[PDB]
C-alpha cells in the first residue's frame, strides 16, 4: 500500500496522468476564479466609488480584474463612478463566466487524459520505455512564455490592441485604465513608474523567446545533466517550486511596499503612507497653498477632496487589522458616509494644538494635544487628579472646517475629548455601523491579506523546495543502496 502522504506519487512515471492531474488542478483554479468573481460581484456595493471603494468592501479578485482593464459590469455600473458603456463580453461577470467555462473544458480534458494515458507520444522511440525530453519541453514552454510576455507587454498594456493598465494619481485621486508608453531608461526600473511594466514585458518576452529557441536547438551537457538530474521530474519540481516562492516573496514585497502594479485606489493605502505622512502632508500642503494665496480657512479646507481625507485615516491602514478579524473593512468600523472635517483645537488664550497621531504598533494610544513647538499642552489624562494638562482645565476648543461640521465650535463638554480621541486616528469621518452590524475593531486591507497569505505560502514552498531537492539529489538512498 501507500501512505496518505504519498498517494499523488502514482503519476511520477505517468506523463499522461500527470497532464490529467495538472488539468484537474487548472480546472479547479479557473473555477475558483470564476466563482470568487461572481461572489464578489454579488456582495459588491458600487454606489459610492469615492468613500466606499472595493478595498473597503473586502474585494479580493476585483482589483486584479480592474488592474488589467475590465471596469464595467453587466449591471450597467462602472467602478470609476461613470455609468457603463457597452461592456461587451469582457465584463466582471463575463470574465467569471469565461473562467467557469474554461474550468469545465479543462475538467473534460483532465478526464480524457486520465482515461487515455498510454499515448505513444510519451514513449521513447529509441528504447520503448516511457520518457520525457525535459530540456526540450522546457525550451517549448519558455518559448511560449516569452511569446505571452511579449504579447502582453507590446499589445495589451501599451494599448495598441489592448486596453492598458490602471494608472492613477500619485495620491490616488483620479485613476483609470489607460494605455502606457514603455520607459526604456533607468526610470523604467522605477517601481512606481507605470512605464516600466510594458518595457519589462517586451524585453523579457524577447529574451525568453531567444532563450526558448536556444533550448530548442541546444542539448545540455552530460555533466550538468547528471549533476541536476535533468532526466528526473522531481528535480524540475524542486527548481520550479524554488522559482515559484521566489516570485511569491517578490509579489508579497511589492504588495506591502506599493508599486505601479499595486494601485492605491484598488488595493487601499499603505502602512508606510500612514507612517510617513503622505496624505497628511499633501493635505496640509494644499491647505497651506490655498491659505497663503487668497482663500481663507473653512473654505480652503472645503477644497480638500473627500477621497484624500479618507486616505488620511488609520482605519484604512493595512497594518491595523487582526488575524481573526475576518471580513470586509466596512464590517469593522462601519461604512463611511461623510467627512466631518478637520478638527482644529485651540487653547483658552489661543494657540493651535495638535493631537498626536496613533502609530501602527499601538492597539490603543494615549490622547495628547501638543504645541506647534513640540511641547505637551493638554491630554485626556488617565489619573485625572494632577497637573495642568486635562482638557477641562486647559480649555481647548475644537472648531472643524469641513463638510458636516464647518463652523460648529465646541469648547465646554467632553465632546472636545471625544473629537480629540477621534483625531488621533487621523481625519474624523462619519460611519454607519448599523447596515452591516459593524464590529468596532479595525480590519485588514486586501493588500495585507494578500501579503500575509503569500509570505506564509512562500515559506511553506521554501520547505517544499528543500524537501523536493533533498528527494531528487538523494534518490538512491531514499529508495535503497542494497548493502553498499
Amino acid at each position: 500500500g501507500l501512505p496518505w502522504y504519498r498517494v499523488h506519487t502514482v503519476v511520477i512515471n505517468d506523463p499522461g496522468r500527470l497532464i490529467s492531474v495538472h488539468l484537474m488542478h487548472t480546472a479547479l483554479v479557473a473555477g475558483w476564479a470564476g466563482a470568487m468573481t461572481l461572489f464578489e460581484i454579488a456582495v459588491f456595493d458600487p454606489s459610492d466609488p469615492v468613500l466606499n471603494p472595493m478595498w473597503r468592501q473586502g474585494m479580493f479578485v476585483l482589483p486584479f480584474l480592474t488592474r488589467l482593464g475590465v471596469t464595467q459590469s453587466w449591471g450597467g455600473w462602472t467602478i470609476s463612478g461613470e455609468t457603463s458603456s457597452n461592456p461587451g463580453i469582457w465584463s466582471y461577470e463575463g470574465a467569471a463566466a469565461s473562467h467557469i467555462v474554461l474550468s469545465g473544458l479543462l475538467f473534460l480534458a483532465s478526464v480524457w487524459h486520465w482515461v487515455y494515458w498510454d499515448l505513444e507520444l510519451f514513449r521513447d522511440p529509441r528504447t520503448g520505455k516511457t520518457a520525457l525530453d525535459l530540456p526540450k519541453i522546457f525550451g517549448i514552454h519558455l518559448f511560449l512564455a516569452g511569446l505571452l510576455c511579449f504579447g502582453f507587454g507590446a499589445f495589451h498594456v501599451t494599448g495598441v490592441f489592448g486596453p492598458g493598465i490602471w494608472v492613477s494619481d500619485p495620491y490616488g485621486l483620479t485613476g483609470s485604465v489607460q494605455p502606457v508608453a514603455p520607459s526604456w531608461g533607468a526610470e523604467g526600473f522605477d517601481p512606481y513608474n507605470p512605464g516600466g511594466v510594458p518595457a519589462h514585458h517586451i524585453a523579457a518576452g524577447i529574451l525568453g523567446v531567444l532563450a526558448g529557441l536556444f533550448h530548442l536547438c541546444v542539448r545540455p551537457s552530460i555533466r550538468l545533466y547528471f549533476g541536476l538530474s535533468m532526466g528526473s521530474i522531481e528535480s524540475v519540481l524542486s527548481s520550479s517550486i524554488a522559482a515559484v516562492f521566489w516570485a511569491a516573496f517578490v509579489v508579497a514585497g511589492t504588495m506591502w511596499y506599493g508599486s505601479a502594479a499595486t494601485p492605491i485606489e484598488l488595493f487601499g493605502p499603505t502602512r508606510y503612507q500612514w507612517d510617513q505622512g503622505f496624505f497628511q502632508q499633501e493635505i496640509q500642503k494644499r491647505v497651506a497653498q490655498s491659505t497663503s494665496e487668497g482663500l481663507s480657512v473653512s473654505e480652503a479646507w472645503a477644497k480638500i477632496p473627500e477621497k484624500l481625507a479618507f486616505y488620511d485615516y488609520i482605519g484604512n491602514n493595512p497594518a491595523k487589522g487582526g488575524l481573526f478579524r475576518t471580513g470586509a473593512m466596512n464590517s469593522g468600523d462601519g461604512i463611511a458616509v461623510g467627512w466631518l472635517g478637520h478638527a482644529s483645537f485651540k487653547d483658552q488664550e489661543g494657540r493651535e494644538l495638535f493631537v498626536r497621531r496613533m502609530p501602527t504598533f499601538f492597539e490603543t494610544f494615549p490622547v495628547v494635544l501638543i504645541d506647534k513647538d513640540g511641547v505637551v499642552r493638554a491630554d485626556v489624562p488617565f489619573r485625572k487628579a494632577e497637573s495642568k494638562y486635562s482638557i477641562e482645565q486647559v480649555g481647548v476648543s475644537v472648531t472643524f472646517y469641513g463638510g458636516e461640521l464647518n463652523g460648529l465650535t465646541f469648547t465646554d463638554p467632553s465632546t472636545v475629548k471625544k473629537y480629540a480621541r477621534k483625531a488621533q486616528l487621523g481625519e474624523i469621518f462619519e460611519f454607519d455601523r448599523s447596515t452591516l452590524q459593524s464590529d468596532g475593531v479595525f480590519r485588514s486591507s486586501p493588500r495585507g491579506w494578500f501579503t500575509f497569505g503569500h509570505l506564509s505560502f512562500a515559506l511553506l514552498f521554501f520547505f517544499g523546495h528543500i524537501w523536493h531537492g533533498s528527494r531528487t539529489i538523494f534518490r538512491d538512498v531514499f529508495a535503497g543502496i542494497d548493502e553498499d
Binding site: 505622512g277 497651506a288 498626536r356 506647534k372
Partner: peptide, 27 residues
C-alpha cells in the same frame, strides 16, 4: 507655501513624516 510652517505643522501630529526625515541635518 511656507515649508518651514508646514514642517512644523506636521511636527506635532507625526514624527515619522518623510518631510521631517529628509534634510534634517539643517534643522
Amino acid at each position: 507655501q511656507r515649508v518651514r510652517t508646514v514642517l512644523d505643522m506636521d511636527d506635532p501630529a507625526k514624527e515619522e513624516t518623510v518631510k521631517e526625515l529628509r534634510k534634517d541635518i539643517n534643522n
